[PDB]
Paper text:
The cGMP-dependent protein kinases (PKG) belong to the family of serine/threonine kinases and are one of the major intracellular receptors for cGMP. Next, two cyclic-nucleotide binding domains (CNBD-A and CNBD-B) are followed by the catalytic domain. Binding of cGMP to the CNBDs is thought to induce a conformational change that activates the kinase by removing the autoinhibitory domain from the catalytic cleft, leaving the catalytic domain free to phosphorylate downstream substrates. To understand the overall architecture of the cGMP-binding domain and the molecular features required for cGMP binding, we determined crystal structures of the CNBD-A of human PKG I bound to cGMP, cAMP or in the absence of bound nucleotide.
To gain additional insight into cyclic-nucleotide binding specificity, we determined the crystal structure of CNBD-A in the presence of cAMP. Despite its unique crystallization buffer conditions, the PKG Iβ:cAMP complex showed similar crystal parameters and contacts as the PKG Iβ:cGMP complex containing two molecules in the unit cell. cAMP:A is similarly located at the interface between the two molecules, but makes no hydrogen bonds with molecule B. A surprising feature of the PKG Iβ (92–227):cAMP complex is that cAMP binds in two different conformations, anti in one molecule and syn in the other. For example, the hydroxyl group of Thr193 at site 2 interacts with the unprotonated nitrogen at the 2-position through a weak hydrogen bond for the syn-configured cAMP whereas no such contact exists in the anti-configured cAMP. Cys173, makes a hydrogen bond with the unprotonated N7 of the syn-configured cAMP, whose distance is 3.6 Å, but no such contact exists for cAMP in the anti conformation. The side chains of Val165 and Met175 near site 3 come within 3.5–3.8 Å of the purine ring for syn-configured cAMP, but they are beyond van der Waals distance for anti-configured cAMP. Superposition of the two molecules at the PBC reveals that the differences in cAMP binding are mainly caused by the β4 and β5 strands moving away from the PBC to accommodate the extended conformation of the anti-configured cAMP. In contrast, the structure with anti-configured cAMP shows the highest B-factors at this region, indicating that site 3 residues do not interact as strongly with the adenine ring. Since a hydrogen atom replaces the 2-NH2 group in cAMP, no such interaction is possible, and cAMP binds the PKG CNBD-A in both syn- or anti-configurations.
Numbering used by the authors:
A (entry chain A): 92 to 218
B (entry chain B): 92 to 219
């Protein structure tokens, strides 16, 4: 008996965008392509209106995100670090390294995201 | 044709302690019992004194460790990330994410560890 990872059907554009977002991320870019494929398939969609706090610094984290549409701002202790648009990963640090969120992430406009949780991610790492 | 993995004889007591540390690990929980047993068999003992740097961030990582005794401190560019005590695994990230060491690991007291090299660990993961 092995657990079946949930599959979320996606458009090819979406799959390409997720794959390129991972390959753009310094910390995830070296994962096997086969693992990236499984991450792509397991990611599920989530949506936020503007001025939404997706991630609060210091919280425990469960999800890594890929941005499909929109723009976020990353701040730490009130200080703007950057902004991110489509094709970018965020919220990966807590999941990769098992720490609390290292920064806060808010939406500047509406956003569409893809998300995958640690548990699913770690299973994929072990295959 | 097929690599024979090293076997390191160990007391039953040590096998148990290593098995527990592995079963306590997020990633390692995913493995089959038999793979976990094979990891236990491939591990070999290594010790470090107080104030040793076992793992330096940015290096190539070819070893995964279980800590039997002792306490260790994890840093990144000088900044304390956390500490880890007995029964914990460390050094698995470089292997699992296929990258250089993501943090620096220094001993806070004398430690006693078990180590498995990357070849064995990956071989065992492949052999489901
Ligand atoms: N200095 C930075 N520059 C760009 N993004 C950052 C920076 N610091 C933190 N982040 C992002 O903000 C996220 C907050 O949650 P995480 O710590 O899980 O992962 C973090 C990164 O994705
Ligand atoms: N918060 C952390 N960030 C990065 N590595 C950590 C952290 N906490 C513990 N570690 C361990 O530090 C190890 C350093 O080598 P690795 O990157 O191979 O594997 C890493 C983890 O096992």
């Amino acid at each position: 008996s092995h657990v079946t990872l949930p599959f979320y059907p996606k458009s090819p554009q979406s799959k390409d965008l997720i794959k390129e977002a991972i390959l753009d991320n310094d910390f995830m870019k070296n994962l096997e392509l086969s693992q990236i494929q499984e991450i792509v398939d397991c990611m599920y969609p989530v949506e936020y209106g503007k001025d939404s706090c997706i991630i609060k610094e210091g919280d425990v984290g469960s999800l890594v995100y890929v941005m499909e549409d929109g723009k976020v701002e990353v701040t730490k202790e009130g200080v703007k670090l950057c902004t991110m648009g489509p094709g970018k990963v965020f919220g990966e640090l807590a999941i990769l390294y098992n720490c609390t969120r290292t920064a806060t992430v808010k939406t500047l406009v509406n956003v569409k995201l893809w998300a995958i949780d640690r548990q699913c991610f770690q299973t994929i790492m072990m295959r």
